[PDB]
Amino acid sequence: MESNNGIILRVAEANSTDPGMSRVRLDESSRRLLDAEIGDVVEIEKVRKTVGRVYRARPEDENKGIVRIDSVMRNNCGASIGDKVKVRKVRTEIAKKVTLAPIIRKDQRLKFGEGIEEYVQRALIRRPMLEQDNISVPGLTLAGQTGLLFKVVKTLPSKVPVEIGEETKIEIREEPASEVLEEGG
């Protein structure tokens, strides 16, 4: 009935900034082989599950089996360039409750508590969320810190790409990257 599936292709990326980790540029066949329409919701899964949206490849002929994403999107699952990831097309929904875990240590500057759940909702509001996903912060930092990224582990939706809204509920835990070392350096 629903017939919801995706395709396995090769992760793409270039030294250029190529900003936009939530946008997937694909060719007409990669988009139309299933149903993906302009600006539909696409999920990606190479090593782990990730979310994103469909875009048109500049070269509507080379993107017939490669997806160009930003470094963070590639870092979200744990894959390298040219690896093989599976992209499944889906739609978005309003997540009602999502929990995440900022990874830092003695260099943790992005923690406040009290209203932090709103601070996360405000920053991540109206955004696609997928448990076990990962996020990053603009070019900001302090001493020699490491990690300093958000690690989502629990969402209310069916583990499908959902969009956060001002009404969505959030949870921030106080457990940093203890016993946690995701591949990447």
Curated annotation (Swiss-Prot):
Signal peptide: none annotated. The keyword ATP-binding applies. It comes from the Archaea. GO terms for molecular function: ATP binding; ATP hydrolysis activity. GO terms for cellular component: cytoplasm; intracellular membrane-bounded organelle. Keywords: ATP-binding, Nucleotide-binding, Repeat. Homohexamer. Forms a ring-shaped particle. Belongs to the AAA ATPase family. CDC48 subfamily. This is VCP-like ATPase. It comes from Thermoplasma acidophilum (strain ATCC 25905 / DSM 1728 / JCM 9062 / NBRC 15155 / AMRC-C165). The lineage of its organism: Archaea, Methanobacteriati, Thermoplasmatota, Thermoplasmata, Thermoplasmatales.
